[PDB]
Amino acid sequence: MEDLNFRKGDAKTDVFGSDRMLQPSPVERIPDGPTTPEVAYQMVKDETFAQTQPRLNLATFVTTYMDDYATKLMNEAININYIDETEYPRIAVMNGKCINIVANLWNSPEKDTWKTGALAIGSSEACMLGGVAAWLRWRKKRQAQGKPFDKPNFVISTGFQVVWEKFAQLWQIEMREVPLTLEKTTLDPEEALKMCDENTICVVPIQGVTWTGLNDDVEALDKALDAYNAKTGYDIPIHVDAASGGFILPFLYPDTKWDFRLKWVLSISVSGHKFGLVYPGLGWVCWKGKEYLPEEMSFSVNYLGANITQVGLNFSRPAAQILGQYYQFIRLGFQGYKEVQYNSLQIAKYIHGEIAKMAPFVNYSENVVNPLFIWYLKPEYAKSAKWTLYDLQDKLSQHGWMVPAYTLPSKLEDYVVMRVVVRQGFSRDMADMLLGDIKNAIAELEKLDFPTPTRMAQE
Amino acid sequence: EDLNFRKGDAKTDVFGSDRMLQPSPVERIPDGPTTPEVAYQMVKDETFAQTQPRLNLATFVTTYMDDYATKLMNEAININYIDETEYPRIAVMNGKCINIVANLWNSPEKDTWKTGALAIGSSEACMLGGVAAWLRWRKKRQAQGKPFDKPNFVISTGFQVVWEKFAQLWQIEMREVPLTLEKTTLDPEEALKMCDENTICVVPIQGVTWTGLNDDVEALDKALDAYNAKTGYDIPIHVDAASGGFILPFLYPDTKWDFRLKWVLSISVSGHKFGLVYPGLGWVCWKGKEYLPEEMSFSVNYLGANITQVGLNFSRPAAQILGQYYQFIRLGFQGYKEVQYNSLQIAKYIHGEIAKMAPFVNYSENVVNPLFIWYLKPEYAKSAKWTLYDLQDKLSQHGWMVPAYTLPSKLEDYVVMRVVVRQGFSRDMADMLLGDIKNAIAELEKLDFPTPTRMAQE
Amino acid sequence: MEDLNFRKGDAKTDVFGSDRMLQPSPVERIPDGPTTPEVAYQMVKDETFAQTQPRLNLATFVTTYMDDYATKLMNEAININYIDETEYPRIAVMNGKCINIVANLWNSPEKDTWKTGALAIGSSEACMLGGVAAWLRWRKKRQAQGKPFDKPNFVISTGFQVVWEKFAQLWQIEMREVPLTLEKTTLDPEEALKMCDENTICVVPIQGVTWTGLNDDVEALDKALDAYNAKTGYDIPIHVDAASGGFILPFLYPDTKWDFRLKWVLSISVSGHKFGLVYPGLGWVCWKGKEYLPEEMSFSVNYLGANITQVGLNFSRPAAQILGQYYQFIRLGFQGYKEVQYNSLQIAKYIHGEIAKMAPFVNYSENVVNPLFIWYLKPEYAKSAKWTLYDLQDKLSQHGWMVPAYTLPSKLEDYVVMRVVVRQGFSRDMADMLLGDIKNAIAELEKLDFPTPTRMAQE
Amino acid sequence: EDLNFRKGDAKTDVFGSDRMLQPSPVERIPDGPTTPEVAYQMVKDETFAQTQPRLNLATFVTTYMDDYATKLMNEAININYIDETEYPRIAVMNGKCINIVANLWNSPEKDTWKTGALAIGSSEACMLGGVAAWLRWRKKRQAQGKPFDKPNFVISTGFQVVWEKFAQLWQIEMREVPLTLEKTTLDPEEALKMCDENTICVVPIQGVTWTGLNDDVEALDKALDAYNAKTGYDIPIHVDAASGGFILPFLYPDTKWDFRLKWVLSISVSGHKFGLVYPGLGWVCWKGKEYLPEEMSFSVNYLGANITQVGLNFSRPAAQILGQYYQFIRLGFQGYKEVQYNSLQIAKYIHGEIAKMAPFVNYSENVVNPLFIWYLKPEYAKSAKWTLYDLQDKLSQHGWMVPAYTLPSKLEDYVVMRVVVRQGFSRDMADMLLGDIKNAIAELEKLDFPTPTRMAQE
């Protein structure tokens, strides 16, 4: 009854009684030959155990939970390539309907039924498309004026997210950075104007600054730019990087005027996979009207009577995230989105208030307007403490959390902060678990008799 | 009696509810919620009335993976790749996939961690290759005191549209080499005629979408070497191998098209085409670290692996990395070879059956990728009442998408039809398709009057 | 239209837009009222994220992987109560067949088709049943001889597992402990005999000592005990605690005489859920013959129909683990068990050898006979190191592992050691991941300028 | 043709294989392996020919949970509870379950973390309560200079077998108070007659398995208070509340049976009976920490919770802890009350329909747990050809298990039948049972000769 080939991968092989599971996974070259599907499944899957669990990843802004029905719907669409719009025209129209809904969430004045916007893989592509459109609009203007157009720049807070550095590098466009101070913890419009000139293609205020959790004041920026543009004729626009805030502000702060209600906001981008409540792979960019999307970048095709704009950096891509976005819009509606974001914001405020009660800590802001916030060590506490927030990050990782510590951008670079992001699926109960682990970690770190490596590096 | 039955309570039947008497939202988010079952049906039911992916014969992109790969990728739906500090095992796995691809392409780079990058498809992978070529050229010309404000690149008129996107989004001039019956792929002398001091690269294509053919990369490399020696322009190749990058290593290992060639400095591929992974995967590799400009890129060490950080996207699904690594382990070289062999053999089979039909003639007698094109015999077309556009419509009535289109410049009088054979399209399915084609021909030959497209051709 | 009850838990509620998920989980009192199944499911499930993943728990000996068919089979039996033998007689017979197979793996000479043994929830119950049986055989013996029987004792290594302390405390039986030394790293028979007297009910050698991974030499103990019993007439028996080794030795070391082949081995216990390859909830105890199981320990019940006779501490219990064990016996057979245990042992040997090459480390034993082993810091390295194995445990926890550090039992209590247990489902690829994390952790700890708290506590 | 088809290769059909022409192993492990599908069928197919759990009316143990509890528990199949350092959240969850149960029983303990312990069932929980009682008594008698080598405990003859196990495995004398028709539950004055200086506790039972009744704990408490005041023996109560512990708090909150009583120092319950969790759960609580001897127990601080480390088992499934905590949150007090109300109402319904049948008379008019027993009317039994054993056999022919058995001491001439109504046994299923009982009666009344069990009674 001996099975000659049991260790070699036949129908009787046990995965963990096989020769293949005594061998390392391939690092440099494809294996010469195959294995059983069960063996290969375990070899790939087992490597993903030893890292952060997504629901305990508190560094990320990107969705780690959807309900079972959205998840089934997206799984069922795993083999649907969005870009095959002639073959899958219902998904092309569904994409156009999502774009319409987003543009109207942002109060677009565009009268066309099919709003001018584009699907993206995240805010990276959406921001780049907005920035490229702004660059081409500026080039066209300056050429018509007989002015040089070879030295473009854009203006942004030092609180920028790295995709704006990617944009600057990949297109060779100069990024001008407005520093953060304790007195100006968000983009100050007067400071932004100091960096504007005839070569500025746009200013980029951020709704949901990743470093701080705050919102740049888009209305204040719009007012300053209106006076500046009237005086110079430079006609510098705004592109709003609303990666998180674009799905927070419409529901919880409808009266905050930050979007297409503003004269100079010509385009807005968002991460559908952050607070749009869809699994990874979704962003959106909208323009205020077709006249702000250059023809040099774009065309539109009619699918089943819908006019669908064709602009993007990617081509073939999963369609699942479109179904997921449209499901969330129908399943939740405005009320449902409001209640989910309310929960996330209330839990963030709850953690913020509990952090403030702890002896080592002080919050950077009293104002929690997105479901995330940052804190640092009280300066008097930090001076005689043996530990830093990097040490607290390490302690929390021992229980499976990722809670990141980092230094703030320019002029606040002496501030080591820690950030918590509250996403859908992070509950009050999970917040209580986190806070209990933070209190326990503090108590252990306060037993140290000698300074840690990062504490010594701060001297 | 349940007062709230139609309004969406726990007893509601989806299709006895008020919501399923209402249209789906076109312009604005609905004011309020519905039950998950109602929303699930409202979204899912809209996807019925379009092509079934396994019958989509226009696409090159994977429509089937086995149950284990599918389960593995489904389980990773909530993993954001870019969180590499949080998910360092996936970051390392990404690096191992890049190593394996670079070695499939015979990279001479000695570093254990090969210079390459994850992409969402060949679109991003091609654009990264082109931007790197543009920046390498800018730096060269700046050092020589030469202008660098008017870049161009050279490509066949058989280009795939991502190169037009690249041209538009970076404002780089695309110079196109036309196709003829005598030169059905990129001709090197004609390509060199379009090269000058401002050319950043030449782009041969392995798996031209319009024709199914391969540009001769080795022939281009030979021509570019003599031209670069004569001019000093130092023009490189970037190979767009969107399909061919996962065909040639297994079925044509001795064809010298990759990093074995002196001037091939970068190569891109669609992992979601013949890399056998569901939508959302491409790769770009450089021949060495010296060809990826520092201005574009940096690298971070995760668990001892050096992972290059270059890309157009940021947050993105990680599932396709697991899927690629699964295919590499599950199939190996032999398994990839056997799957691509099956796809190519079925393409050749259909190609041979098409040639036997009276209306048809194949564009090429040689099938080197699992796809091919044919057109109507000229004498048949002249007296026929129908065109290949009419055949496309007839086939769609049975659920197929088989596209008809005109070929690019100088061949634009040729209306062709294309079949792509992917994993999961079997000999049995090929027989169904061929049977539907014969029936469709038989119906179209009964027409007494020309169709609209037949009339538009006169 | 707006749903007035959306936050309160109706059919439209989103789990994470509900009032319930702004509230803590219940600590003291049952909630007054219900919630939706989806809310309750998340509230309980989400609390389990922030702890060790079972497949990365390298402290446990207990099975964390079975294949999909065993898992489905056991899931399908979740509502089957084993003890209802009149209602579920086929599972009762299946339990008996498992007992037969285990007794025959251990070379029972018992001729009855139905072997003398009992189901247990683990080695805890199995050991207690073996110990109670030894105690009752000894009481009856001493009563017949007109000798006292009120002060029983048993003899065991200080490497005992805590269930023997439970046995000592819950029955008020004296435990006599034989210390470990570097010269006698397992139970020395001569020293064990020195603790024996007329009140000793048994000696307990261990196959798979939890502290060390080693096997007590049962054959040496049997030989010494035979001479001791011939001299004293005390007739002290052996009960083998084979919690791990009972499913290793028969397959990988068939010629090692440790089981019912030995004259004085009257009972043996094992954890079916350790290297028996079944999910948690399984142990077995076998006796060499019916004459060694006292009649006082069998019981009969009639209130579940017909007549059910049993031996055990528990009563109602899941039956799933019986199905799982019988599946493994049929699915793997002798060859399959041998190949699975071979993989586990070979991977343990591989890690053991790589640990030995690292500058900080020295292995406790050169002999790896169970799929687990321990190491400690080289004494010369430890003296000048700023860190201890407790710090390495903490570093590994940051990547999801549990690799436990602890002090060895008596006379070796100055030795802080670390243990790795290799179970089915822990592959060579996972070993490489662990070893890479160990090397990285060593390199970080070697950067410390000051001693850690545990390093200071050692001086 | 596949040469190895019968031998177990990738093409083998389970029921076209050599292995399914062979017997399952009885004595020895098979020499070699088989495919998972064959092994799965070999084990699964043996479980068909026995009682379906939802038709098992003998058992008190849960046979139904909802789909979410079931999924949650299945997902925890590989979690070993005892690894509390590795799984500290489940350790804390266990402690919260103990808190909730202790508070359901009106514990006066002030500590946040109540003194209690997880068990596999009431067997382990009862044994822990008895051992604790035995050790408290040993310590007192030693301090008084009195003997402590001959312990005993007092219980009704309606005890469940675990108390016999406790008696035999610890060699502790069990003193039994018999049942009579005049004293259908434990009579306290009769219990006190068997108490002396060596009695470690008296064990009243809430949910007597034989009868379905509750011993009067408050009446016992009152009698013990006077006896302890007279003797100084200070004999305590341990309540075996295996079933009643999850019935009385919801349906009879004002019945004083628990830690509200002075002498009730510990209580045990089966979480897998009317705690509504699948097999593998019991709980024991003590009235305070001072009643759990240190010799049995220590406590460890996991994440700021005080968890007591006392038990007979060690490694064990953690799934049942999640199931218990899910039920507490999913149902709450109201949900438990409504579920137990349903079970009790259905038991009362069956009880009333049984009483209307000519052959039958109920043992008690009072149904306080969701179960009851009946027997044959004495005048009917005398001229009947059949017994309740014959009715058990007839009902088994339709898949039911409804057990017939003789009652304990002094009622051992009474053959009775028991029905237990658990969650998942509805009014509709009760109607099916009652229809089968009536059909069985009509068939048995056609007998012309006595059955073997009927002859055995005369």
Ligand SMILES: *Cc1c(COP(=O)(O)O)cnc(C)c1O
């Ligand atoms: C997330 C983020 C980005 C990047 O968006 P992705 O969705 O990760 O591509 C850009 N800007 C801000 C403010 C962000 O938070």
Ligand SMILES: *Cc1c(COP(=O)(O)O)cnc(C)c1O
């Ligand atoms: C598919 C294709 C592309 C575009 O690649 P995507 O994977 O769809 O982004 C580019 N070039 C060629 C030759 C292609 O076939």
Ligand SMILES: *Cc1c(COP(=O)(O)O)cnc(C)c1O
């Ligand atoms: C596992 C272990 C025990 C405890 O057995 P469980 O299966 O956890 O109940 C007892 N003795 C030894 C040697 C062990 O390894």
Ligand SMILES: *Cc1c(COP(=O)(O)O)cnc(C)c1O
């Ligand atoms: C069921 C029962 C027991 C045994 O409990 P298990 O949960 O089966 O271990 C003990 N006493 C009573 C009163 C019971 O009903």
